[PDB]
Amino acid sequence: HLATAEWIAEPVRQKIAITHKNKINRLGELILTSESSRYQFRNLADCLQKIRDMITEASQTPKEPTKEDVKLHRIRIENMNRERLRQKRIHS
Amino acid sequence: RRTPPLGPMPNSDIDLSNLERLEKYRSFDRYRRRAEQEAQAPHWWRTYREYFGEKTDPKEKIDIGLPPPKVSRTQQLLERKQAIQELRANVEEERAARLRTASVPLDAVRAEWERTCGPYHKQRLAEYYGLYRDLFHGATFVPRVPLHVAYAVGEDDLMPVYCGNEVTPTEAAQAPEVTYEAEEGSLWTLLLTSLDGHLLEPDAEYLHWLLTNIPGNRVAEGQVTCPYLPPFPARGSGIHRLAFLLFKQDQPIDFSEDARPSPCYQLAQRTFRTFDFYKKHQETMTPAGLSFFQCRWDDSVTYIFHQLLDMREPVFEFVRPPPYHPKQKRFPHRQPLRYLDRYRDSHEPTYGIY
Amino acid sequence: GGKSSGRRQGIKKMEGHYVHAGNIIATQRHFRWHPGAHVGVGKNKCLYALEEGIVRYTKEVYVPHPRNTEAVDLITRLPKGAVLYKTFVHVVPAKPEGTFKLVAML
Amino acid sequence: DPVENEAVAPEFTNRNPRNLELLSVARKERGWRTVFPSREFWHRLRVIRTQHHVEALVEHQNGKVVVSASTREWAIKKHLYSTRNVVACESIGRVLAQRCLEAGINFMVYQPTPWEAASDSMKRLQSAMTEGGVVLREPQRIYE
Amino acid sequence: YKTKPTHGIGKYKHLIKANLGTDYEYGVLNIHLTAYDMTLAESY
Ligand SMILES: [Mg+2]
C-alpha cells in the first residue's frame, strides 16, 4: 500500500501515485513484478531496485527538457488537431 | 507448344501498318493516365487486385435509406449559371483571382456542402470505416438529414462529433447535446453503440445510450429507454469506434422488450446488437441520421471501471508472434557462432549434474 | 578460355510456395521479373520476400519512375492507347501483425 | 464469487480498420521499387488537374477513397471565380484539409512528379494543407 | 511463359519502328523563308 506506507515522505508518495498510476490496483496497492532471471533472489533484487529508483526519482524530481519520442510525435500532433477542432459556444 | 489466348490482347486493337501515322503519347502524364485507366479494367489473367483487392458480393448493396428527394435540374442549373455569371462579371473577384489572393468562406462552403453533397460523402466515409459491414451484416444508408452532436467542456468549450474524429472519454463523460432539423409530427429515436468496446463476445457490441419517441427537436422529453453510459475502451486495446444513430418512426413504437433498468451497470444487460433489432423494428422504423467518432483510453476510464461498473479494469497489450527459426541442425555449416544463441532459451549459465 | 560455369540463376520459389522473410525469390542477370507487394530487390537485381506469405505471379501495367529518363523516353514514343505489361511477383502475407490479449487485471 | 462484469475474453478482437494505423504497427505495402509511385503508405493524396476542373482525393492503399474535394461541387463553385487556377487549387487544399481534420485523418503521403511539384499551384496547396494542420509524412511502422 | 496463353504479352518493340516519291504525292519538300526581319521570318 502506497498511502499507508509511512516510511516514505508524503510528497514522495503523492508523486509516486501520480507518475506510476498504471501500477496501482483497485485496492491502492502498488505492484512491481520481475521475470528477468531464473532466480528468485535476482528477481527480488530487481523489484527492490525498481522501488529504490522510483523513490530517488521522486526525490530528485528532474525538470530537464527531455527528448520527444517518435511514438509521442503523432500523439501530440493529433492532440493539437483535437484542440484546434474544439469549439466555443456563441452565447455564454 | 503455344496456346491461344483466352481473351483479347492488350495491344491487339492498335494497328501497326501505319504506326508512324499513329499519334504518340509524347508525354509521361498521358501514358500514366492511360495506364491507370487500363489497370482499373478487368482482365482475364492474374492481377494484383485479384489477390489483394477486396471481394464484394455480386448482389447489389441493399439500401434502407430514405427515398431520394426530387429537384428541378434545369432551374437549379439556370440559377447556378446566373450566379457564376454575376460572380465572373464582378471585377474585384476577377482581380483577386488573377492576383491569386482571393479567399473562400470555409463556414459557408461547409454549410452548403452539408445540404448538397454531405450525405454521400458521409456514407462513403462510413463505408470506409466499415460500420455498414459490422452492423447490419451488410447494408447501405444515406444520411439525408444532418445531425450535430457536441460535448460540453468547461462553461464555453464544445467538442464536436462530426465523423470519425477523436474524442476522449473525459470529454464524453457527460451527456452530449444533439441538434437536427425536424418539424412537428415526427418521432425520433437516438441510439449509441460501441463497435469494439465488447470484452467477452467479439461479435456483439455494447449499447451506451438509447432514447425513444423524441418529439421533434425536443430531445429531453424523449423516453429514456436506457440511461447514458460513457464509453470504457480498455487500456492497450487500441482505438474503438462509437456510433450515434438517429431513426424515424412512422408509427409510435413500444420499447418494453429492449428496456433497461435505471441504472444499467451490468455488461450482460448492456450487450446489444443492431442486427435483428433493426430487423424486428424495420417495419415501423427507418434511419435518418448517422454519426460516429473514435475513442482511446484515458484516466477517466479507470474511474468508470472502478466505480461506475464496479470492477477491476482489464489492461491489454499488443504482442507480435515469436520469430521463426529453421529446425536446428547438428552441424550448422558455415554459420556464425551466434547460431546457438537463437535456440538457447535462457542466458544464465548452466552446470548440469555438477 | 571461356570455360565458365552456369550461374544457377532463375526462379527459386514457384507459384503457391510458402516463403519466410528474407528468402530469395528469384535471381537474374536482367530485370526479367519485377517486384510487387512486399518484395525487395538488391543491388544485383536479386528478389527477396519482405513478409512471410505465399508467392504469386501476375501481369501488371508498367509505369516507370520519372527520374528514369531512358524508360520515360521509351514510353513517350508509344502510339496513343498502347500500354506496356510486365511480369510482377508478389507475396501475400499469411499471419497478422499481432494480437491483443489480457495481460493484467487491475 | 465470480463477477459477471469482470468476465473478459483472454484475447481482444478489435475490428476498427484504422486501429493498427493509429498504433503505427500496420504493415505497409513495401516494394514496387521499379515502378512509380510507391505504395508504402496508409493514406495517399492524389491531385487531378483537368482542363476545366481540379479534384483532390485522399484514399487508402487498398483502393478505397476516404475523402474528396472537387471543383465540380456547388458549395465551392458559388464562391470560386475559376476552377482551373491557383485560387481554385488553394481553395481545394483548404477545404480538403478541413474535411480531413473533421474526419480524423492527419497524416498522408504526397507523390508528385517533379514538374507538378515545382508547379506553383501545388506548392500553395501544400501550404494550405500545412496551415490546415494536415501532415504529408506518415510515421514509420513500428516493427519492434 | 511461352507455353501459357499469356505468351508475348510483354512484347513492346513491335509497337516501335525498327525516301521514295510516289506518283500521287511528293516525297520531300523544302519551304525557305527569306526576310530582312528575323523576328517576322521566325514567327512565320
Ligand atoms: Mg559453356
UniProtKB/Swiss-Prot annotation, chain A:
Methylation of glutamine in the GGQ triplet by HEMK1. Transmembrane segments: none annotated. Down-regulated during the in vitro differentiation of HT29-D4 colon carcinoma cells. It is found in: Mitochondrion. Essential peptidyl-tRNA hydrolase component of the mitochondrial large ribosomal subunit. Acts as a codon-independent translation release factor that has lost all stop codon specificity and directs the termination of translation in mitochondrion, possibly in case of abortive elongation. Involved in the hydrolysis of peptidyl-tRNAs that have been prematurely terminated and thus in the recycling of stalled mitochondrial ribosomes. Component of the mitochondrial large ribosomal subunit (mt-LSU). Mature mammalian 55S mitochondrial ribosomes consist of a small (28S) and a large (39S) subunit. The 28S small subunit contains a 12S ribosomal RNA (12S mt-rRNA) and 30 different proteins. The 39S large subunit contains a 16S rRNA (16S mt-rRNA), a copy of mitochondrial valine transfer RNA (mt-tRNA(Val)), which plays an integral structural role, and 52 different proteins. Belongs to the prokaryotic/mitochondrial release factor family. Mitochondrion-specific ribosomal protein mL62 subfamily. This is Large ribosomal subunit protein mL62. The chain holds residues 104 to 195 of 206 of the full protein.
Swiss-Prot record, chain B:
It is found in: Mitochondrion. PANTHER family: LARGE RIBOSOMAL SUBUNIT PROTEIN ML38, PHOSPHATIDYLETHANOLAMINE-BINDING PROTEIN. It comes from the Eukaryota. One of its GO terms (cellular component) is cytosol. Keywords: Coiled coil, Mitochondrion, Ribonucleoprotein, Ribosomal protein, Transit peptide. Its main location: mitochondrion. This is Large ribosomal subunit protein mL38. The keyword S-adenosyl-L-methionine does not apply. Component of the mitochondrial large ribosomal subunit (mt-LSU). Mature mammalian 55S mitochondrial ribosomes consist of a small (28S) and a large (39S) subunit. The 28S small subunit contains a 12S ribosomal RNA (12S mt-rRNA) and 30 different proteins. The 39S large subunit contains a 16S rRNA (16S mt-rRNA), a copy of mitochondrial valine transfer RNA (mt-tRNA(Val)), which plays an integral structural role, and 52 different proteins. mL38 is located at the central protuberance. One of its GO terms (biological process) is mitochondrial translation. The keyword Transferase does not apply. Residues 73-101 form a coiled coil. The lineage of its organism: Eukaryota, Metazoa, Chordata, Craniata, Vertebrata. InterPro entries: PEBP (IPR008914), PEBP-like_sf (IPR036610), PEBP_euk (IPR035810). Belongs to the phosphatidylethanolamine-binding protein family. Mitochondrion-specific ribosomal protein mL38 subfamily.
UniProtKB/Swiss-Prot annotation, chain D:
One of its GO terms (molecular function) is 5S rRNA binding. One of its GO terms (cellular component) is mitochondrial large ribosomal subunit. Keywords: Chaperone, Mitochondrion, Ribonucleoprotein, Ribosomal protein, RNA-binding, Transit peptide, Transport. Signal peptide: none annotated. GO terms for biological process: mitochondrial translation; rRNA import into mitochondrion; translation. Component of the mitochondrial large ribosomal subunit (mt-LSU). Mature mammalian 55S mitochondrial ribosomes consist of a small (28S) and a large (39S) subunit. The 28S small subunit contains a 12S ribosomal RNA (12S mt-rRNA) and 30 different proteins. The 39S large subunit contains a 16S rRNA (16S mt-rRNA), a copy of mitochondrial valine transfer RNA (mt-tRNA(Val)), which plays an integral structural role, and 52 different proteins. Together with thiosulfate sulfurtransferase (TST), acts as a mitochondrial import factor for the cytosolic 5S rRNA. The precursor form shows RNA chaperone activity; is able to fold the 5S rRNA into an import-competent conformation that is recognized by rhodanese (TST). Both the cytoplasmic and mitochondrial forms are able to bind to the helix IV-loop D in the gamma domain of the 5S rRNA. Belongs to the universal ribosomal protein uL18 family. This is Large ribosomal subunit protein uL18m. It comes from Homo sapiens. The lineage of its organism: Eukaryota, Metazoa, Chordata, Craniata, Vertebrata.
UniProtKB/Swiss-Prot annotation, chain E:
Component of the mitochondrial large ribosomal subunit (mt-LSU). Mature mammalian 55S mitochondrial ribosomes consist of a small (28S) and a large (39S) subunit. The 28S small subunit contains a 12S ribosomal RNA (12S mt-rRNA) and 30 different proteins. The 39S large subunit contains a 16S rRNA (16S mt-rRNA), a copy of mitochondrial valine transfer RNA (mt-tRNA(Val)), which plays an integral structural role, and 52 different proteins. mL48 is located at the central protuberance. Interacts with OXA1L. The gene is MRPL48. Belongs to the mitochondrion-specific ribosomal protein mL48 family. It is found in: Mitochondrion. This is Large ribosomal subunit protein mL48.
